[PDB]
Protein backbone atom coordinates (compact mmCIF):
# COMPACT_ATOMS: atom_id res chain seq x y z
CA UNK A 1 0.00 0.00 0.00
CA UNK A 2 1.54 3.12 -1.34
CA UNK A 3 1.38 6.23 1.07
CA UNK A 4 2.95 9.73 1.27
CA UNK A 5 2.10 11.62 4.12
CA UNK A 6 2.50 15.77 4.24
CA UNK A 7 3.60 17.49 7.94
CA UNK A 8 1.05 19.69 9.61
CA UNK A 9 -0.48 23.21 8.62
CA UNK A 10 1.93 26.13 9.13
CA UNK A 11 1.78 29.30 10.26
CA UNK A 12 4.31 31.52 9.08
CA UNK A 13 5.68 34.99 9.21
CA UNK A 14 6.17 37.41 6.16
CA UNK A 15 9.78 36.88 5.27
CA UNK A 16 10.76 33.56 6.60
CA UNK A 17 10.60 30.59 5.24
CA UNK A 18 9.60 27.37 6.07
CA UNK A 19 10.57 23.46 5.31
CA UNK A 20 7.89 20.92 4.28
CA UNK A 21 8.12 17.09 4.37
CA UNK A 22 6.86 14.34 2.14
CA UNK A 23 7.74 10.99 3.70
CA UNK A 24 6.92 8.01 1.63
CA UNK A 25 6.48 4.17 1.88
CA UNK A 26 5.14 0.98 0.20
CA UNK A 27 7.51 1.23 -2.85
CA UNK A 28 11.29 2.33 -3.77
CA UNK A 29 11.81 5.40 -3.07
CA UNK A 30 14.38 5.74 -5.08
CA UNK A 31 12.88 4.72 -8.32
CA UNK A 32 10.33 7.31 -8.93
CA UNK A 33 9.96 10.98 -9.83
CA UNK A 34 8.05 12.88 -7.06
CA UNK A 35 6.80 15.98 -7.71
CA UNK A 36 5.40 19.47 -6.11
CA UNK A 37 1.94 21.00 -6.91
CA UNK A 38 0.52 24.49 -5.45
CA UNK A 39 -3.12 24.94 -5.16
CA UNK A 40 -4.20 28.40 -4.18
CA UNK A 41 -7.84 29.55 -3.30
CA UNK A 42 -9.76 26.56 -4.61
CA UNK A 43 -9.39 25.64 -8.12
CA UNK A 44 -6.20 26.90 -9.18
CA UNK A 45 -3.10 24.25 -9.85
CA UNK A 46 0.48 25.12 -10.75
CA UNK A 47 3.21 22.86 -11.06
CA UNK A 48 6.38 23.44 -9.27
CA UNK A 49 9.42 20.83 -9.53
CA UNK A 50 10.28 17.45 -9.61
CA UNK A 51 12.48 15.24 -8.18
CA UNK A 52 14.36 11.74 -8.57
CA UNK A 53 15.85 11.25 -5.58
CA UNK A 54 18.03 8.41 -6.68
CA UNK A 55 20.34 11.27 -7.84
CA UNK A 56 19.24 14.40 -6.34
CA UNK A 57 18.26 15.50 -9.84
CA UNK A 58 15.63 18.03 -10.16
CA UNK A 59 14.16 20.31 -12.76
CA UNK A 60 11.86 23.65 -11.85
CA UNK A 61 9.48 25.48 -13.17
CA UNK A 62 11.26 29.03 -13.65
CA UNK A 63 8.70 30.84 -11.43
CA UNK A 64 9.63 29.11 -8.66
CA UNK A 65 13.62 29.06 -8.96
CA UNK A 66 14.68 31.03 -5.86
CA UNK A 67 11.62 30.54 -3.89
CA UNK A 68 11.49 26.65 -3.81
CA UNK A 69 14.29 24.13 -3.11
CA UNK A 70 13.60 20.41 -3.52
CA UNK A 71 15.66 17.66 -1.28
CA UNK A 72 15.44 14.04 -0.73
CA UNK A 73 16.67 12.08 1.97
CA UNK A 74 16.77 8.26 0.99
CA UNK A 75 17.61 6.42 4.68
CA UNK A 76 14.15 7.90 5.66
CA UNK A 77 12.47 7.96 2.31
CA UNK A 78 11.48 11.58 2.62
CA UNK A 79 11.23 14.14 0.12
CA UNK A 80 11.47 18.03 0.95
CA UNK A 81 10.40 21.54 -0.44
CA UNK A 82 12.08 24.68 0.73
CA UNK A 83 10.19 27.61 0.65
CA UNK A 84 12.42 31.01 1.11
CA UNK A 85 11.54 34.54 2.17
CA UNK A 86 7.47 34.01 1.96
CA UNK A 87 4.86 36.89 1.26
CA UNK A 88 0.97 36.46 0.34
CA UNK A 89 1.20 34.56 -3.08
CA UNK A 90 2.69 32.14 -0.85
CA UNK A 91 -0.02 31.28 1.14
CA UNK A 92 -1.67 27.75 -0.75
CA UNK A 93 -2.19 24.33 -0.42
CA UNK A 94 1.01 22.63 -1.35
CA UNK A 95 0.84 18.78 -2.54
CA UNK A 96 3.38 15.92 -3.17
CA UNK A 97 2.85 13.13 -5.91
CA UNK A 98 4.63 10.25 -6.63
CA UNK A 99 3.10 10.91 -10.37
CA UNK A 100 3.57 7.87 -11.98
CA UNK A 101 5.73 8.82 -15.40
CA UNK A 102 7.77 6.71 -16.08
CA UNK A 103 9.80 8.19 -18.98
CA UNK A 104 11.26 5.54 -20.46
CA UNK A 105 8.56 3.46 -20.83
CA UNK A 106 6.46 6.33 -22.23
CA UNK A 107 3.51 5.46 -20.07
CA UNK A 108 2.75 5.66 -16.65
CA UNK A 109 2.14 3.88 -13.24
CA UNK A 110 -0.91 5.24 -10.63
CA UNK A 111 -0.13 8.41 -9.43
CA UNK A 112 -0.38 8.80 -4.96
CA UNK A 113 -0.43 12.00 -3.82
CA UNK A 114 -0.23 13.45 -0.23
CA UNK A 115 -2.92 15.05 2.00
CA UNK A 116 -1.26 18.26 1.08
CA UNK A 117 0.18 20.82 4.03
CA UNK A 118 -1.76 24.16 4.16
CA UNK A 119 1.20 27.55 4.39
CA UNK A 120 -0.80 30.25 6.07
CA UNK A 121 1.72 33.81 5.87
CA UNK A 122 0.65 36.11 8.11
CA UNK A 123 1.98 37.90 11.42
CA UNK A 124 -1.21 37.93 12.97
CA UNK A 125 -0.98 36.30 16.63
CA UNK A 126 -2.47 32.68 17.26
CA UNK A 127 -5.71 33.11 19.30
CA UNK A 128 -7.66 29.86 21.18
CA UNK A 129 -10.97 29.67 20.12
CA UNK A 130 -14.27 30.20 22.65
CA UNK A 131 -16.68 27.41 22.23
CA UNK A 132 -20.31 27.75 22.51
CA UNK A 133 -23.08 25.57 22.40
CA UNK A 134 -26.34 25.85 20.48
CA UNK A 135 -29.51 24.27 22.00
CA UNK A 136 -32.81 25.32 20.34
CA UNK A 137 -36.17 27.19 21.51
CA UNK A 138 -37.39 28.15 17.83
CA UNK A 139 -34.41 25.73 16.07
CA UNK A 140 -35.86 23.21 17.78
CA UNK A 141 -37.95 22.05 14.37
CA UNK A 142 -41.05 20.94 16.14
CA UNK A 143 -40.92 16.98 17.05
CA UNK A 144 -39.29 14.17 15.21
CA UNK A 145 -35.97 15.86 14.43
CA UNK A 146 -34.17 18.42 16.70
CA UNK A 147 -30.83 20.22 15.72
CA UNK A 148 -28.79 21.19 18.04
CA UNK A 149 -25.33 23.29 17.23
CA UNK A 150 -21.84 24.50 17.94
CA UNK A 151 -20.02 27.93 17.46
CA UNK A 152 -16.54 28.50 17.59
CA UNK A 153 -15.56 31.94 17.33
CA UNK A 154 -12.49 34.53 17.41
CA UNK A 155 -9.15 31.75 16.91
CA UNK A 156 -6.28 32.08 14.26
CA UNK A 157 -5.14 30.73 12.80
CA UNK A 158 -6.79 27.63 11.12
CA UNK A 159 -7.73 24.42 11.29
CA UNK A 160 -9.81 23.31 14.10
CA UNK A 161 -11.25 20.27 14.46
CA UNK A 162 -14.79 19.63 15.66
CA UNK A 163 -16.45 16.32 16.24
CA UNK A 164 -19.76 15.33 17.98
CA UNK A 165 -19.60 12.69 20.84
CA UNK A 166 -16.39 12.36 20.30
CA UNK A 167 -16.59 11.14 16.85
CA UNK A 168 -19.06 8.38 17.38
CA UNK A 169 -21.82 10.50 16.18
CA UNK A 170 -21.22 11.41 12.63
CA UNK A 171 -24.56 11.27 10.65
CA UNK A 172 -26.82 14.15 10.57
CA UNK A 173 -23.38 16.34 10.96
CA UNK A 174 -23.14 19.72 8.47
CA UNK A 175 -19.68 21.29 9.57
CA UNK A 176 -19.06 24.75 7.53
CA UNK A 177 -16.38 26.30 6.36
CA UNK A 178 -14.11 28.88 8.35
CA UNK A 179 -14.86 32.32 7.39
CA UNK A 180 -11.87 34.98 8.40
CA UNK A 181 -12.56 38.72 9.99
CA UNK A 182 -11.04 40.92 11.52
CA UNK A 183 -8.03 38.59 12.04
CA UNK A 184 -10.31 36.10 13.57
CA UNK A 185 -11.92 33.14 12.16
CA UNK A 186 -15.56 32.04 13.09
CA UNK A 187 -16.77 28.25 12.31
CA UNK A 188 -20.19 26.39 13.21
CA UNK A 189 -21.60 22.65 12.84
CA UNK A 190 -25.33 21.41 13.19
CA UNK A 191 -26.22 17.99 13.79
CA UNK A 192 -29.77 16.82 13.53
CA UNK A 193 -31.07 14.07 16.04
CA UNK A 194 -35.04 12.98 16.78
CA UNK A 195 -36.79 14.30 19.80
CA UNK A 196 -36.08 10.64 21.52
CA UNK A 197 -32.47 10.78 21.55
CA UNK A 198 -31.94 14.48 22.73
CA UNK A 199 -32.42 15.74 25.48
CA UNK A 200 -32.58 11.97 26.71
CA UNK A 201 -28.80 11.42 25.94
CA UNK A 202 -26.22 13.69 25.35
CA UNK A 203 -24.56 15.30 22.49
CA UNK A 204 -21.45 16.82 22.89
CA UNK A 205 -19.46 19.09 20.70
CA UNK A 206 -15.96 18.09 20.55
CA UNK A 207 -12.83 20.92 19.86
CA UNK A 208 -9.20 20.88 19.19
CA UNK A 209 -7.07 23.83 17.75
CA UNK A 210 -3.49 22.35 17.96
CA UNK A 211 -1.86 25.76 17.10
CA UNK A 212 -3.06 26.56 20.40
CA UNK A 213 -3.01 23.69 22.64
CA UNK A 214 -6.65 23.95 22.96
CA UNK A 215 -9.11 21.10 23.75
CA UNK A 216 -12.36 22.12 24.96
CA UNK A 217 -16.08 19.86 25.03
CA UNK A 218 -19.17 21.58 25.58
CA UNK A 219 -22.15 19.33 26.01
CA UNK A 220 -25.65 20.71 24.40
CA UNK A 221 -27.62 20.89 27.84
CA UNK A 222 -31.50 22.58 27.70
CA UNK B 1 3.83 29.17 -21.01
CA UNK B 2 0.96 26.94 -22.72
CA UNK B 3 -2.24 28.59 -21.52
CA UNK B 4 -5.24 25.80 -21.26
CA UNK B 5 -8.68 26.99 -21.73
CA UNK B 6 -11.44 24.90 -19.99
CA UNK B 7 -15.26 25.25 -20.63
CA UNK B 8 -17.99 25.26 -18.98
CA UNK B 9 -16.88 26.31 -15.95
CA UNK B 10 -19.20 24.57 -13.83
CA UNK B 11 -21.89 22.21 -15.52
CA UNK B 12 -24.97 20.77 -13.25
CA UNK B 13 -26.20 17.36 -14.47
CA UNK B 14 -28.47 14.62 -12.78
CA UNK B 15 -27.60 11.53 -12.36
CA UNK B 16 -27.89 8.80 -15.58
CA UNK B 17 -27.24 11.68 -17.89
CA UNK B 18 -24.27 12.54 -20.11
CA UNK B 19 -21.59 15.30 -19.22
CA UNK B 20 -18.52 16.66 -21.46
CA UNK B 21 -15.73 19.35 -20.88
CA UNK B 22 -13.77 21.06 -23.15
CA UNK B 23 -9.94 21.77 -22.85
CA UNK B 24 -8.05 24.07 -25.46
CA UNK B 25 -4.75 25.19 -25.39
CA UNK B 26 -2.14 27.72 -26.83
CA UNK B 27 0.57 25.36 -28.68
CA UNK B 28 -0.48 22.13 -30.04
CA UNK B 29 0.05 19.43 -27.77
CA UNK B 30 2.02 17.05 -29.78
CA UNK B 31 5.30 16.44 -28.50
CA UNK B 32 8.21 15.82 -30.79
CA UNK B 33 8.22 12.11 -30.62
CA UNK B 34 4.64 11.73 -31.67
CA UNK B 35 2.81 11.21 -28.15
CA UNK B 36 0.26 13.78 -26.90
CA UNK B 37 0.86 14.17 -23.20
CA UNK B 38 -2.49 15.84 -22.37
CA UNK B 39 -3.88 14.15 -18.69
CA UNK B 40 -7.34 14.76 -16.92
CA UNK B 41 -7.54 14.79 -12.91
CA UNK B 42 -10.15 14.85 -10.89
CA UNK B 43 -10.46 16.39 -7.26
CA UNK B 44 -13.20 15.19 -5.23
CA UNK B 45 -14.60 17.89 -2.03
CA UNK B 46 -11.48 17.95 0.58
CA UNK B 47 -9.49 15.11 -1.20
CA UNK B 48 -6.18 15.07 -3.47
CA UNK B 49 -6.59 15.30 -7.01
CA UNK B 50 -6.10 12.13 -8.81
CA UNK B 51 -5.35 11.06 -12.54
CA UNK B 52 -8.39 9.76 -14.34
CA UNK B 53 -6.79 10.41 -17.87
CA UNK B 54 -3.18 9.85 -19.74
CA UNK B 55 -1.95 10.63 -23.59
CA UNK B 56 -5.38 11.70 -24.07
CA UNK B 57 -7.66 8.71 -24.10
CA UNK B 58 -6.19 6.23 -21.56
CA UNK B 59 -7.79 5.43 -18.91
CA UNK B 60 -6.10 4.99 -15.49
CA UNK B 61 -6.03 1.96 -13.60
CA UNK B 62 -9.25 1.95 -11.56
CA UNK B 63 -10.99 4.55 -13.28
CA UNK B 64 -14.52 3.79 -14.53
CA UNK B 65 -14.32 2.99 -18.50
CA UNK B 66 -17.85 5.60 -18.33
CA UNK B 67 -14.94 7.78 -18.39
CA UNK B 68 -13.67 8.71 -22.27
CA UNK B 69 -11.29 11.24 -23.18
CA UNK B 70 -10.56 12.30 -26.79
CA UNK B 71 -9.16 14.97 -28.93
CA UNK B 72 -5.53 16.33 -30.38
CA UNK B 73 -3.47 18.89 -31.58
CA UNK B 74 -5.02 22.12 -29.39
CA UNK B 75 -8.53 20.72 -28.48
CA UNK B 76 -9.42 17.89 -26.46
CA UNK B 77 -12.46 16.71 -24.57
CA UNK B 78 -13.40 14.84 -21.33
CA UNK B 79 -16.57 12.67 -21.73
CA UNK B 80 -18.76 10.59 -18.80
CA UNK B 81 -21.12 8.72 -20.51
CA UNK B 82 -23.23 8.12 -17.64
CA UNK B 83 -22.87 10.76 -14.44
CA UNK B 84 -23.18 9.06 -10.76
CA UNK B 85 -22.94 10.90 -7.53
CA UNK B 86 -19.25 9.80 -7.37
CA UNK B 87 -18.35 11.94 -10.12
CA UNK B 88 -18.92 15.38 -8.29
CA UNK B 89 -16.00 17.37 -7.82
CA UNK B 90 -13.51 19.70 -10.26
CA UNK B 91 -12.12 18.04 -13.17
CA UNK B 92 -8.77 19.65 -14.71
CA UNK B 93 -6.64 19.30 -18.14
CA UNK B 94 -3.08 19.52 -17.48
CA UNK B 95 -0.07 19.40 -20.50
CA UNK B 96 2.84 18.02 -20.06
CA UNK B 97 4.05 18.39 -23.39
CA UNK B 98 5.50 21.81 -23.24
CA UNK B 99 7.28 22.84 -20.10
CA UNK B 100 6.50 23.88 -17.60
CA UNK B 101 3.45 21.61 -17.10
CA UNK B 102 0.48 23.82 -17.12
CA UNK B 103 -3.25 23.45 -15.99
CA UNK B 104 -6.70 24.32 -16.84
CA UNK B 105 -8.81 26.23 -14.65
CA UNK B 106 -11.08 23.18 -13.62
CA UNK B 107 -14.63 22.82 -13.80
CA UNK B 108 -16.99 22.40 -11.27
CA UNK B 109 -19.65 19.37 -11.41
CA UNK B 110 -22.41 19.58 -9.67
CA UNK B 111 -25.09 17.02 -9.74
CA UNK B 112 -28.79 18.65 -10.08
CA UNK B 113 -31.14 16.91 -8.02
CA UNK B 114 -35.11 17.90 -7.51
CA UNK B 115 -35.86 21.45 -5.91
CA UNK B 116 -35.50 20.99 -2.27
CA UNK B 117 -36.50 23.47 0.65
CA UNK B 118 -34.20 24.51 3.19
CA UNK B 119 -34.80 23.57 7.45
CA UNK B 120 -34.13 26.52 9.15
CA UNK B 121 -32.95 26.53 12.86
CA UNK B 122 -32.26 29.78 14.71
CA UNK B 123 -30.59 30.01 17.90
CA UNK B 124 -29.99 32.72 20.81
CA UNK B 125 -26.82 33.31 22.31
CA UNK B 126 -25.66 31.12 25.34
CA UNK B 127 -25.19 32.23 28.67
CA UNK B 128 -21.66 32.03 28.24
CA UNK B 129 -21.22 34.22 25.11
CA UNK B 130 -23.47 36.83 27.14
CA UNK B 131 -20.92 36.51 29.90
CA UNK B 132 -18.59 37.71 28.06
CA UNK B 133 -20.23 40.56 26.29
CA UNK B 134 -20.89 39.52 23.50
CA UNK B 135 -24.31 37.82 21.70
CA UNK B 136 -24.35 35.73 18.17
CA UNK B 137 -27.81 35.00 16.45
CA UNK B 138 -27.37 31.32 14.43
CA UNK B 139 -29.38 30.58 11.34
CA UNK B 140 -28.36 27.01 10.12
CA UNK B 141 -30.77 26.63 6.75
CA UNK B 142 -29.84 22.94 5.60
CA UNK B 143 -30.61 20.93 2.76
CA UNK B 144 -31.79 22.96 -0.10
CA UNK B 145 -31.34 22.83 -3.47
CA UNK B 146 -30.35 25.07 -6.03
CA UNK B 147 -27.53 26.57 -4.33
CA UNK B 148 -28.72 29.99 -5.23
CA UNK B 149 -30.42 31.60 -2.03
CA UNK B 150 -30.34 35.05 0.13
CA UNK B 151 -30.19 35.47 3.90
CA UNK B 152 -31.60 38.76 5.49
CA UNK B 153 -31.24 39.60 9.22
CA UNK B 154 -34.01 41.81 10.50
CA UNK B 155 -34.05 42.75 14.08
CA UNK B 156 -37.44 44.50 15.19
CA UNK B 157 -38.54 44.70 11.64
CA UNK B 158 -35.26 46.63 9.52
CA UNK B 159 -32.33 44.97 8.38
CA UNK B 160 -29.74 44.72 9.48
CA UNK B 161 -26.42 44.42 7.26
CA UNK B 162 -23.54 44.93 9.27
CA UNK B 163 -21.92 42.36 11.86
CA UNK B 164 -23.34 39.10 9.35
CA UNK B 165 -21.11 35.92 8.81
CA UNK B 166 -22.41 33.36 6.13
CA UNK B 167 -20.46 30.19 5.00
CA UNK B 168 -21.60 27.58 2.99
CA UNK B 169 -21.16 23.64 2.37
CA UNK B 170 -20.21 22.16 -0.78
CA UNK B 171 -22.73 20.06 -2.48
CA UNK B 172 -23.22 16.98 -0.26
CA UNK B 173 -22.31 13.42 -2.12
CA UNK B 174 -24.92 11.42 -0.15
CA UNK B 175 -28.20 13.89 -1.31
CA UNK B 176 -26.57 16.18 -3.42
CA UNK B 177 -28.48 19.11 -1.10
CA UNK B 178 -26.67 22.61 0.37
CA UNK B 179 -26.45 23.72 3.45
CA UNK B 180 -25.53 27.22 5.03
CA UNK B 181 -24.94 28.70 8.46
CA UNK B 182 -25.64 32.76 8.77
CA UNK B 183 -24.11 34.30 12.07
CA UNK B 184 -25.28 37.65 13.49
CA UNK B 185 -22.90 38.93 16.25
CA UNK B 186 -23.88 41.90 17.86
CA UNK B 187 -22.57 43.19 22.02
CA UNK B 188 -24.40 41.86 25.07
CA UNK B 189 -26.11 45.41 25.60
CA UNK B 190 -27.35 45.61 22.36
CA UNK B 191 -28.83 42.26 22.03
CA UNK B 192 -30.87 42.90 25.17
CA UNK B 193 -32.24 46.39 23.62
CA UNK B 194 -34.39 44.79 20.59
CA UNK B 195 -36.98 41.85 20.90
CA UNK B 196 -37.26 40.24 17.44
CA UNK B 197 -34.81 38.73 16.02
CA UNK B 198 -35.66 37.39 12.42
CA UNK B 199 -33.36 34.96 10.01
CA UNK B 200 -35.51 35.63 6.31
CA UNK B 201 -34.50 33.89 2.88
CA UNK B 202 -35.48 34.02 -0.65
CA UNK B 203 -35.18 30.54 -2.18
CA UNK B 204 -37.02 28.97 -5.50
CA UNK B 205 -38.93 26.58 -3.59
CA UNK B 206 -41.11 29.24 -1.97
CA UNK B 207 -43.09 32.52 -3.58
CA UNK B 208 -42.76 34.34 -0.06
CA UNK B 209 -39.80 34.79 2.01
CA UNK B 210 -38.99 31.61 4.33
CA UNK B 211 -39.29 32.79 8.03
CA UNK B 212 -37.49 31.78 11.48
CA UNK B 213 -37.46 34.13 14.60
CA UNK B 214 -37.78 34.31 18.51
CA UNK B 215 -38.81 36.88 20.61
CA UNK B 216 -36.05 37.61 23.78
CA UNK B 217 -37.97 38.41 26.62
CA UNK B 218 -38.30 37.24 30.59
CA UNK B 219 -39.33 34.14 32.31
C1 LIG C 1 7.95 19.01 -19.80
C2 LIG C 1 8.53 17.81 -20.46
N1 LIG C 1 7.74 16.66 -20.98
C3 LIG C 1 7.89 15.29 -20.74
O1 LIG C 1 8.95 14.74 -20.54
C4 LIG C 1 6.58 14.47 -20.63
C5 LIG C 1 5.93 14.65 -19.24
C6 LIG C 1 4.51 14.18 -19.30
P1 LIG C 1 3.65 14.17 -17.77
O2 LIG C 1 2.26 13.77 -17.99
O3 LIG C 1 4.42 13.41 -16.78
O4 LIG C 1 3.72 15.76 -17.33
C7 LIG C 1 3.17 16.17 -16.13
C8 LIG C 1 3.84 15.84 -14.94
C9 LIG C 1 3.23 16.20 -13.74
C10 LIG C 1 2.02 16.86 -13.72
N2 LIG C 1 1.34 17.17 -12.41
O5 LIG C 1 0.20 17.69 -12.41
O6 LIG C 1 1.90 16.91 -11.32
C11 LIG C 1 1.38 17.19 -14.95
C12 LIG C 1 1.96 16.84 -16.17
C13 LIG C 1 9.91 17.41 -19.82
O7 LIG C 1 9.93 17.01 -18.66
O8 LIG C 1 10.94 17.52 -20.49
ZN1 LIG D 1 -0.88 3.97 -20.10
ZN1 LIG E 1 7.38 23.68 -26.00
ZN1 LIG F 1 9.63 22.64 -28.31
ZN1 LIG G 1 -35.60 49.72 16.35
ZN1 LIG H 1 -38.14 50.95 18.40
ZN1 LIG I 1 -35.00 47.09 18.28
ZN1 LIG J 1 -37.21 48.63 20.61
Known amino acids: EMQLQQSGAELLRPGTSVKLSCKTS????????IHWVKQRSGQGLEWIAR????????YYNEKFKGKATLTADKSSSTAYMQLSTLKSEDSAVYFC????????????????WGQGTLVTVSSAKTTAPSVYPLAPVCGDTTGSSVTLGCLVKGYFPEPVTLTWNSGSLSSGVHTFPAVLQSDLYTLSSSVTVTSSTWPSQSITCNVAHPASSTKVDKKIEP | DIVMTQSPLTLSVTIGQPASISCKSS???????????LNWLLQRPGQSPKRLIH???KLDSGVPDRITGSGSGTDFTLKISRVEAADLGVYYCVQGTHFPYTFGGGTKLEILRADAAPTVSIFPPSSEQLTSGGASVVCFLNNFYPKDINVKWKIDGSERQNGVLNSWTDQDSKDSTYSMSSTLTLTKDEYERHNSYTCEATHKTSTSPIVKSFNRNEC
Open chain 1, 97 to 112: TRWGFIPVREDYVMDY
Open chain 2, 55 to 57: LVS
Open chain 2, 27 to 37: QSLLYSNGKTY
Open chain 1, 26 to 33: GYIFTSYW
Open chain 1, 51 to 58: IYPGTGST
